Amino acid sequence: YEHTATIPNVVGFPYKAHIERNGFSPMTLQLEVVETSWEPTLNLEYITCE
Amino acid sequence: VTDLSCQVVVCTHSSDFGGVATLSYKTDKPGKCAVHSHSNVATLQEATVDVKEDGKVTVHFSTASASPAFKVSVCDAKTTCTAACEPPKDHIVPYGAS
Amino acid sequence: KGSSLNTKAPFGCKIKTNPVRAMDCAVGSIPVSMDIPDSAFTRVVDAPA
């Protein structure tokens, strides 16, 4: 009642899992992924101009 | 009827008995058929058999024993079947018997 | 200010401004744990024959 996976994490892939247990029917599913912006723990330095 | 062809749909964990059985009773007149099955290894679901004439009369059957063999007394005969009673997901629940 | 950060980006990421987007990259997979419902599978005799 709790499966697990790991799909290709580029956007532009249909993940899908056809997992069913005994007596539950064959649980097909189709997940997709969209954008995942990186943005690390950044600290600004100098505010340079003329 | 004859040809006691049992179609055990699911071999459950399991809980309250429930599980798949289906006597493909090669019968000419469906009706009230003898249901309660001649084997204590798995507890039967129902008691009478709604006999589909030449039909898979469905039935419940619950056994918790993972090496199950269900030998029913489908009124005009016995009926042989064996399916692995595959163990369930949860841990604690209302009831079960097999 | 020469070649762009996202524009000269390797790893195929969409780079972009202040909410500093580096997204849809060609990097990493998606792990997942799916606590499936009871209602997601059909019945045991609930299926068509």
Swiss-Prot record, chain A:
Reported function: Class II viral fusion protein. Fusion activity is inactive as long as E1 is bound to E2 in mature virion. After virus attachment to target cell via host MXRA8 and endocytosis, acidification of the endosome induce dissociation of E1/E2 heterodimer and concomitant trimerization of the E1 subunits. This E1 trimer is fusion active, and promotes release of viral nucleocapsid in cytoplasm after endosome and viral membrane fusion. Efficient fusion requires the presence of cholesterol and sphingolipid in the target membrane.
Localisation: Virion membrane; Host cell membrane
Membrane topology value: Single-pass type I membrane protein
Protein name per its UniProtKB record: Spike glycoprotein E1
Maturation and modification: N-glycosylated.
Complex and partners: Interacts with spike glycoprotein E2. The precursor of protein E3/E2 and E1 form a heterodimer shortly after synthesis. Processing of the precursor of protein E3/E2 into E2 and E3 results in a heterodimer of the spike glycoproteins E2 and E1. Spike at virion surface are constituted of a trimer of E2-E1 heterodimers. After target cell attachment and endocytosis, E1 change conformation to form homotrimers. Interacts with 6K protein. E1/E2 heterodimer interacts with host LDLR.
UniProtKB/Swiss-Prot annotation, chain C:
Membrane topology recorded in Swiss-Prot or TrEMBL: Single-pass type I membrane protein
Post-translational modification: N-glycosylated.
Disulfide bonds: C13-C25
Subcellular location: Virion membrane; Host cell membrane
Superkingdom of origin: Viruses
Quaternary organization: Interacts with spike glycoprotein E2. The precursor of protein E3/E2 and E1 form a heterodimer shortly after synthesis. Processing of the precursor of protein E3/E2 into E2 and E3 results in a heterodimer of the spike glycoproteins E2 and E1. Spike at virion surface are constituted of a trimer of E2-E1 heterodimers. After target cell attachment and endocytosis, E1 change conformation to form homotrimers. Interacts with 6K protein. E1/E2 heterodimer interacts with host LDLR.
Function: Class II viral fusion protein. Fusion activity is inactive as long as E1 is bound to E2 in mature virion. After virus attachment to target cell via host MXRA8 and endocytosis, acidification of the endosome induce dissociation of E1/E2 heterodimer and concomitant trimerization of the E1 subunits. This E1 trimer is fusion active, and promotes release of viral nucleocapsid in cytoplasm after endosome and viral membrane fusion. Efficient fusion requires the presence of cholesterol and sphingolipid in the target membrane.
Protein name: Spike glycoprotein E1
